[PDB]
Write a protein that binds this ligand. Structure first.
Ligand code: OHT
Ligand code: OHT
Ligand code: CHD
Ligand code: CHD
Lengths: 216, 224
């Protein structure tokens, strides 16, 4: 077994919940607010998780932040994609918040959710395992291509270590396909692309009580 | 060991130089630079379409899928081209032998942010010492792995990806045994290529929005 990959499994964060309020009228506003709150709570956990990635803490705090700033959305997206592998045309943002097509339209996330579903499809066909998922996650962070990195060589070494862990895992656990590690790496471009779409949509995406009182 | 068939075909199919040929009668300006790049791009894209037909297995996909792949990866192929041509240079982008943009030229063209992002790609490939054989293979892989949402025959496209991926892996095993993970490191550069290309396409349309390209037939229609 690969020590780094096994270590990554154990450092995997605990499940987080959306906890949507059932007495609140279902709406785009509710959905988006639920997702935003869920994301922020997942991110606090992600920041702590990173510190357990072998080598991450040896980087400067400036570089640690740069990597996290460049890859935070890719980590969130990869999480949802993974939790959705055993579902059909649905996204498990959380055990207590699974979105189907109709819910996506109502939240104005049809396009974006379908892109995320594109990722789920590829991973389904490859039968992505938990070991591969957590290693790819760490790789996405290490390979986030921030332009503000101070020690390029230290980040490259970080990438090389996680990359070796993945090929080592793939070499022993999947001899039926000697190109499986490469196929995993080839899914990163779509992850980066979908992550970019999500971030772009987040910005693109009031106080009626007080407002009505100001007019009164 | 002798290069496998795929890499051999790609090296032979590699297009001859293409010049930007900016109009000498037109004074320098942001509009000129952008007009020049657009014209070069269009001629390169014509050459790229013919080049793809020479990629083993591409002409076997339906014409709809051939189109989808090309419509998804055209900018990545063009960007990988400029990046490769700029490897032996420093802080300058070689769009063509007759069109090299340094920083001050980029600022004048309004392309500083985009060109700086393209130079980021150059920097990575320079440290890896990207070779021509790896370059032609990556262009082909970028085309097959473009991730279009309009693919009809997913398995056919997946097979094309595997054949090209194998060509790279085999090339690296025989040519760079000293680094058992060199093929993987090449593949890991694709995300930045996708990111920079998306950034370029978006900047292009923001340009045509606040205006862009000096249309030839335009003034003729008005003078007529
Ligand atoms: C796809 C759902 C989503 C987010 C999400 C994705 C995966 C996941 O596990 C949890 C949430 C999402 C929404 C908001 C968000 O904010 C981060 C910034 N904070 C500091 C305000 C992040 C992700 C989203 C992204 C762009 C526009 C609208 C919604
Ligand atoms: C970076 C230079 C560039 C182009 C380019 C890149 C690589 C290369 O080898 C040659 C040019 C560029 C400009 C226009 C363009 O148009 C394609 C669409 N046609 C059909 C109008 C493509 C690339 C560009 C891209 C977006 C905005 C401004 C300029
Ligand atoms: C949610 C949390 C604060 C929790 C709290 O109220 O105590 C804050 C503190 C640090 C924040 C993060 C940092 O500002 C770094 C990143 C900045 C990006 O623009 C968004 C994600 C990003 C990763 C942030 C997510 C988030 O809003 C964080 C994680
Ligand atoms: C330049 C050439 C025609 C030039 C001419 O002889 O007049 C045209 C004809 C078909 C065009 C292509 C097709 O419309 C398909 C693609 C559409 C994308 O938006 C740009 C690239 C794209 C790949 C196009 C590049 C280009 O503008 C093409 C290749």
């Amino acid at each position: 077994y690969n020590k780094i990959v096994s270590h990554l499994l154990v450092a995997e964060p605990e499940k987080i919940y959306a906890m949507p309020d059932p007495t609140v009228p279902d709406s785009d506003i509710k959905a988006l607010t639920t997702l935003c709150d869920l994301a922020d709570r997942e991110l606090v956990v992600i920041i702590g998780w990173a510190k357990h990635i072998p080598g991450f803490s040896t980087l400067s705090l400036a570089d640690q932040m740069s990597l996290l700033q460049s890859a935070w959305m890719e980590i969130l997206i990869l999480g949802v994609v993974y939790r959705s592998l055993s579902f059909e045309d649905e996204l498990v943002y959380a055990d207590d918040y699974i979105m189907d097509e109709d819910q996506s339209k109502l939240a104005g996330l049809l396009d974006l959710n379908n892109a995320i579903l594109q990722l789920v499809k590829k991973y389904k066909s490859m039968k992505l395992e938990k070991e591969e998922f957590v290693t790819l996650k760490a790789i996405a962070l290490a390979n986030s291509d921030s332009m503000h990195i101070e020690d390029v060589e230290a980040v490259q070494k970080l990438q090389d270590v996680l990359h070796e862990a993945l090929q080592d895992y793939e070499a022993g656990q999947h001899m039926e396909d000697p190109r499986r590690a490469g196929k995993m790496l080839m899914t990163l471009p779509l992850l980066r692309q979908t992550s970019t779409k999500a971030v772009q949509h987040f910005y693109n995406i009031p106080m009626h009580k007080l407002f009505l009182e100001m007019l009164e």
